[PDB]
C-alpha cells in the first residue's frame, strides 16, 4: 500500500484548525503499523500431524 | 413608539456606514479606503492562519 507517513501529511494538510488536536488520535491509529490480531485456533497443522 | 429609539438610531448607523470622504470642503468621489479594524482583521486571519 501507500506509506504511512504521507497519509500523515495528506489527513493533517485535510484537517481544518478546530479539527486538527481531535483528529491526531485517528491519524495516529490510521498510520499505526498492523499488528495481526490473534486468529483462529485449529487444530494441529497436517504437517503437525 | 418603543421602537423610536431604535429605527433613529439605525437611520443614523444608516448613514454612518456610508460615510463620505471630503477633499477639503468638497467631496472625493471614488475614494475607497481600508479602516484600521478592517485591516487588523485581515492581520489576525492571516496570522491565524499561518498558526494553524
Redesign the interface.
Known amino acids: 500500500e501507500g506509506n504511512s507517513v504521507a497519509g500523515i501529511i495528506k489527513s493533517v494538510n485535510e484537517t481544518?484548525?478546530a479539527n486538527?488536536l481531535s483528529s491526531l488520535k485517528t491519524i495516529k491509529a490510521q498510520a499505526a503499523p498492523i499488528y495481526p490480531a490473534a486468529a483462529s485456533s485449529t487444530g494441529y497443522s497436517t504437517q503437525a500431524k | 413608539a418603543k421602537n423610536a429609539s431604535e429605527v433613529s438610531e439605525l437611520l443614523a448607523k444608516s448613514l454612518a456606514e456610508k460615510a463620505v470622504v471630503t477633499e477639503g470642503g468638497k467631496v472625493v468621489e471614488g475614494f475607497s479606503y481600508v479602516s484600521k479594524a478592517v485591516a487588523a482583521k485581515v492581520i489576525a486571519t492571516r496570522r491565524?492562519?499561518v498558526?494553524?
Open positions: 481544518s484548525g486538527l | 491565524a492562519e498558526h494553524e
